[PDB]
Design an enzyme around this catalytic site. Structure first.
Site, PDB file in Angstrom:
ATOM      1  N   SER B  34      21.085 -37.344  47.463  1.00  0.00           N
ATOM      2  CA  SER B  34      21.506 -36.080  48.111  1.00  0.00           C
ATOM      3  C   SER B  34      21.959 -35.137  47.011  1.00  0.00           C
ATOM      4  O   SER B  34      23.082 -35.246  46.522  1.00  0.00           O
ATOM      5  CB  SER B  34      22.569 -36.388  49.141  1.00  0.00           C
ATOM      6  OG  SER B  34      22.846 -35.212  49.876  1.00  0.00           O
ATOM      7  N   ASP B  36      23.375 -32.415  46.141  1.00  0.00           N
ATOM      8  CA  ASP B  36      24.243 -31.404  46.752  1.00  0.00           C
ATOM      9  C   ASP B  36      24.915 -30.595  45.670  1.00  0.00           C
ATOM     10  O   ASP B  36      26.070 -30.770  45.350  1.00  0.00           O
ATOM     11  CB  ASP B  36      25.208 -32.084  47.706  1.00  0.00           C
ATOM     12  CG  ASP B  36      24.520 -32.558  48.943  1.00  0.00           C
ATOM     13  OD1 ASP B  36      23.499 -31.978  49.324  1.00  0.00           O
ATOM     14  OD2 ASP B  36      25.018 -33.521  49.549  1.00  0.00           O
ATOM     15  N   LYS B  58      16.868 -35.350  48.559  1.00  0.00           N
ATOM     16  CA  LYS B  58      17.273 -34.545  49.704  1.00  0.00           C
ATOM     17  C   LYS B  58      17.955 -33.284  49.212  1.00  0.00           C
ATOM     18  O   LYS B  58      18.917 -33.371  48.441  1.00  0.00           O
ATOM     19  CB  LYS B  58      18.214 -35.335  50.617  1.00  0.00           C
ATOM     20  CG  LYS B  58      18.568 -34.638  51.894  1.00  0.00           C
ATOM     21  CD  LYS B  58      19.504 -35.440  52.766  1.00  0.00           C
ATOM     22  CE  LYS B  58      20.942 -35.449  52.312  1.00  0.00           C
ATOM     23  NZ  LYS B  58      21.548 -34.093  52.343  1.00  0.00           N
ATOM     24  N   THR B  59      17.512 -32.146  49.722  1.00  0.00           N
ATOM     25  CA  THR B  59      18.034 -30.831  49.373  1.00  0.00           C
ATOM     26  C   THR B  59      18.772 -30.211  50.531  1.00  0.00           C
ATOM     27  O   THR B  59      18.517 -30.474  51.686  1.00  0.00           O
ATOM     28  CB  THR B  59      16.845 -29.918  48.972  1.00  0.00           C
ATOM     29  OG1 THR B  59      15.896 -29.784  50.035  1.00  0.00           O
ATOM     30  CG2 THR B  59      16.173 -30.341  47.736  1.00  0.00           C
ATOM     31  N   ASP B  89      17.171 -31.047  54.209  1.00  0.00           N
ATOM     32  CA  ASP B  89      18.111 -31.518  55.254  1.00  0.00           C
ATOM     33  C   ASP B  89      18.613 -30.316  56.045  1.00  0.00           C
ATOM     34  O   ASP B  89      19.817 -30.104  56.126  1.00  0.00           O
ATOM     35  CB  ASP B  89      19.234 -32.276  54.553  1.00  0.00           C
ATOM     36  CG  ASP B  89      20.160 -33.062  55.418  1.00  0.00           C
ATOM     37  OD1 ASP B  89      19.739 -33.522  56.519  1.00  0.00           O
ATOM     38  OD2 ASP B  89      21.275 -33.331  54.959  1.00  0.00           O
ATOM     39  N   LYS B  91      18.373 -29.715  59.352  1.00  0.00           N
ATOM     40  CA  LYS B  91      18.979 -29.970  60.643  1.00  0.00           C
ATOM     41  C   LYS B  91      18.636 -28.855  61.641  1.00  0.00           C
ATOM     42  O   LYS B  91      19.496 -28.272  62.307  1.00  0.00           O
ATOM     43  CB  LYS B  91      20.482 -30.203  60.557  1.00  0.00           C
ATOM     44  CG  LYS B  91      20.843 -31.366  59.634  1.00  0.00           C
ATOM     45  CD  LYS B  91      22.275 -31.792  59.818  1.00  0.00           C
ATOM     46  CE  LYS B  91      22.573 -33.092  59.120  1.00  0.00           C
ATOM     47  NZ  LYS B  91      23.940 -33.549  59.409  1.00  0.00           N
ATOM     48  N   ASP B  94      17.606 -25.405  67.124  1.00  0.00           N
ATOM     49  CA  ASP B  94      17.468 -24.209  67.960  1.00  0.00           C
ATOM     50  C   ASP B  94      16.300 -24.441  68.908  1.00  0.00           C
ATOM     51  O   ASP B  94      15.666 -25.491  68.911  1.00  0.00           O
ATOM     52  CB  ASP B  94      17.335 -22.973  67.055  1.00  0.00           C
ATOM     53  CG  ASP B  94      17.900 -21.692  67.612  1.00  0.00           C
ATOM     54  OD1 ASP B  94      17.719 -21.430  68.852  1.00  0.00           O
ATOM     55  OD2 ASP B  94      18.540 -20.935  66.851  1.00  0.00           O
ATOM     56  N   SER B 149      27.181 -39.672  60.596  1.00  0.00           N
ATOM     57  CA  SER B 149      28.196 -40.418  59.828  1.00  0.00           C
ATOM     58  C   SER B 149      29.637 -39.919  60.051  1.00  0.00           C
ATOM     59  O   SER B 149      30.582 -40.561  59.597  1.00  0.00           O
ATOM     60  CB  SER B 149      27.868 -40.391  58.356  1.00  0.00           C
ATOM     61  OG  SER B 149      27.885 -39.074  57.869  1.00  0.00           O
ATOM     62  N   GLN B 207      33.877 -36.983  56.814  1.00  0.00           N
ATOM     63  CA  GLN B 207      32.856 -37.944  56.348  1.00  0.00           C
ATOM     64  C   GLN B 207      33.483 -39.327  56.297  1.00  0.00           C
ATOM     65  O   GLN B 207      34.634 -39.477  55.860  1.00  0.00           O
ATOM     66  CB  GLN B 207      32.348 -37.548  54.997  1.00  0.00           C
ATOM     67  CG  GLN B 207      31.300 -38.456  54.358  1.00  0.00           C
ATOM     68  CD  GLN B 207      29.990 -38.472  55.107  1.00  0.00           C
ATOM     69  OE1 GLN B 207      30.001 -38.750  56.329  1.00  0.00           O
ATOM     70  NE2 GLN B 207      28.880 -38.250  54.416  1.00  0.00           N
ATOM     71  N   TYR B 209      32.477 -43.419  54.958  1.00  0.00           N
ATOM     72  CA  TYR B 209      31.531 -44.186  54.130  1.00  0.00           C
ATOM     73  C   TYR B 209      31.443 -45.650  54.550  1.00  0.00           C
ATOM     74  O   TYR B 209      32.427 -46.279  54.950  1.00  0.00           O
ATOM     75  CB  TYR B 209      31.879 -44.073  52.636  1.00  0.00           C
ATOM     76  CG  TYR B 209      31.757 -42.674  52.102  1.00  0.00           C
ATOM     77  CD1 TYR B 209      30.505 -42.076  52.126  1.00  0.00           C
ATOM     78  CD2 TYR B 209      32.817 -41.944  51.649  1.00  0.00           C
ATOM     79  CE1 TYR B 209      30.347 -40.788  51.647  1.00  0.00           C
ATOM     80  CE2 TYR B 209      32.645 -40.636  51.245  1.00  0.00           C
ATOM     81  CZ  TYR B 209      31.399 -40.049  51.231  1.00  0.00           C
ATOM     82  OH  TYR B 209      31.276 -38.767  50.757  1.00  0.00           O
ATOM     83  N   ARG B 228      27.875 -37.517  46.803  1.00  0.00           N
ATOM     84  CA  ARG B 228      29.026 -37.549  45.876  1.00  0.00           C
ATOM     85  C   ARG B 228      29.176 -38.875  45.141  1.00  0.00           C
ATOM     86  O   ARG B 228      29.648 -38.853  43.997  1.00  0.00           O
ATOM     87  CB  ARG B 228      30.289 -37.171  46.638  1.00  0.00           C
ATOM     88  CG  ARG B 228      30.387 -35.663  46.858  1.00  0.00           C
ATOM     89  CD  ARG B 228      31.408 -35.238  47.887  1.00  0.00           C
ATOM     90  NE  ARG B 228      30.987 -35.555  49.232  1.00  0.00           N
ATOM     91  CZ  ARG B 228      31.650 -35.311  50.352  1.00  0.00           C
ATOM     92  NH1 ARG B 228      32.843 -34.721  50.277  1.00  0.00           N
ATOM     93  NH2 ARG B 228      31.131 -35.597  51.526  1.00  0.00           N
TER      94      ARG B 228
END
Ligand SMILES: O=C(O)c1cc(=O)[nH]c(=O)n1[C@@H]1O[C@H](COP(=O)(O)O)[C@@H](O)[C@H]1O
Ligand SMILES: O=C(O)c1cc(=O)[nH]c(=O)n1[C@@H]1O[C@H](COP(=O)(O)O)[C@@H](O)[C@H]1O
Lengths: 256, 256
Positions: B34, B36, B58-59, B89, B91, B94, B149, B207, B209, B228
């Site tokens: 990820s 991020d 993943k962006t 990502d 999501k 709509d 998560s 979040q 884990y 992270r």
């Protein structure tokens, strides 16, 4: 039931909600234009011509082919001139840590120009917590998506009740809902309802329409959100006036 | 239970899923980074250094301060060189008519560069229908968000079952899930699980884990998504290797 102008003065009203309710009563409009266009020039020409008729202009900044922050500077000028709020219909729907960055940063810098944004409640209340950490300091508000207009929506029953609870527990930031109906009994919360057209029908991809009289008058919502019913019409000003008059009279007749 | 390499050959496999499963087995990785970060240079330096260790990057294109389509050109070069898929990502969440434009158009042109995207199921199946009208012709795939998560997630019980049904009814386009666990019993569908760190804990914004051994080994998912736990580490390459080895051994030990 209180008028929009009286709701604007309620003790627990949010400042963004108060500003909105005041201009709704001043202008006799409870219409939100869904400016679902891909050209900045068209967005701005619609905002200028329809500004007097609307309480709010809803954007999808991520469909604008020629987005720049300067376009949004020009939109704010129009919003100030004509007195309407800007609502970015971003539907934040990630963990709190992610949505804070999506709201403040990137190319769009949404929080810098949007009075209002919205969020899904499915991730839990961290979505609101994350947004509010950007939006509270920037004096913004947020709407929670309690019901949806589309066929097969799972935003029903306990889901809608969870959205209402989440809003009510975050009233510092959350000013209302996207919903099909009045879902909160607290008058400080705005109800905005998409899936609106004068005629019966739908689209090919699950949209379903109800009339202004149905959603404002029978279902008790506050504001109609209208895209194609206006945008696809030849004369978008007269279309906006039709929708404005429909929504406003439906509101008046429910106040009695 | 079949190996990733055997799953890649299943009759009903989607081409994107097959490509992914093949490179997972070739490279002995079931780790999705990820990425991020807000700087293109950091995104690309991570993609290059960690590319050999990952099956997927993943962006969140909407947190990149200096996004351009050329950045994504450079990312694709790295994805081709090192053999990983790109997953935006986004999501989508709509109505179908809106998400088609959000996927194809605007500044980001997501469909032009993302192998995979994901969507929430809360709007109903029109969200998938809209996306698939862009993504099928562009030979893309989509993941449905069946579980989340974050604390307070409403993606449980009947909601998760609805996501699984929706995926299974749109297998032409939907290749799997974001989930915390195996949710589909059909081996053609990928399970990707975020909320992963080696150590117990969480963040300040909901979040939560779980370890690679828990989600791959005990909960039966396929791929871990790690942000992270890698990104905040000093040596992100060795962190990625730790996560890769953890996830891969957990997968092996479940195949027996
Ligand atoms: O958040 C929204 O405004 C929204 C929620 C919902 O349940 N349904 C819905 O249609 N919308 C949005 O409202 C607009 C509806 O546009 P029309 O169907 O053209 O009137 C679109 O921009 C949708 O993205
Ligand atoms: O779709 C996702 O990847 C996602 C779904 C979910 O349930 N939880 C979740 O954390 N994510 C994303 O996965 C990443 C988790 O990052 P870390 O918490 O830093 O490992 C973030 O980019 C989230 O946006």
């Amino acid at each position: 039931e209180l008028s929009f102008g009286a709701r604007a003065e309620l003790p627990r009203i949010h400042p963004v909600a108060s500003k909105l309710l005041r201009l709704m009563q001043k202008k006799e409009t409870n219409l939100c234009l869904s400016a679902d266009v891909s050209l900045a020039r068209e967005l701005l020409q619609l905002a200028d011509a329809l500004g007097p008729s609307i309480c709010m202009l809803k954007t999808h900044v991520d469909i604008l082919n020629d987005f720049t922050l300067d376009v949004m500077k020009e939109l704010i000028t129009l919003a100030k001139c004509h007195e309407f709020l800007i609502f970015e219909d971003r539907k934040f729907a990630d963990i709190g840590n992610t949505v804070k960055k999506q709201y403040e940063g990137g190319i769009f810098k949404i929080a810098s120009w949007a009075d209002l944004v919205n969020a899904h409640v499915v991730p839990g209340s961290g979505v609101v917590k994350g947004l509010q950490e950007v939006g509270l300091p920037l004096h913004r508000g947020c709407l929670l998506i309690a019901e949806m207009s589309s066929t097969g929506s799972l935003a029903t029953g306990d889901y809608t009740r969870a959205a209402v609870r989440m809003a009510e527990e975050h009233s510092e930031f959350v000013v209302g809902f996207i919903s099909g109906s009045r879902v909160s009994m607290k008058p400080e919360f705005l109800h905005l309802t998409p899936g609106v057209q004068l005629e019966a029908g739908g689209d090919n991809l699950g949209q379903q329409y109800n009339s202004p009289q149905e959603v404002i008058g029978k279902r008790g919502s506050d504001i109609i959100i209208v895209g194609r019913g206006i945008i696809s019409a030849a004369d978008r000003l007269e279309a906006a006036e039709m929708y404005r008059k429909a929504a406003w009279e439906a509101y008046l007749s429910r106040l009695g």
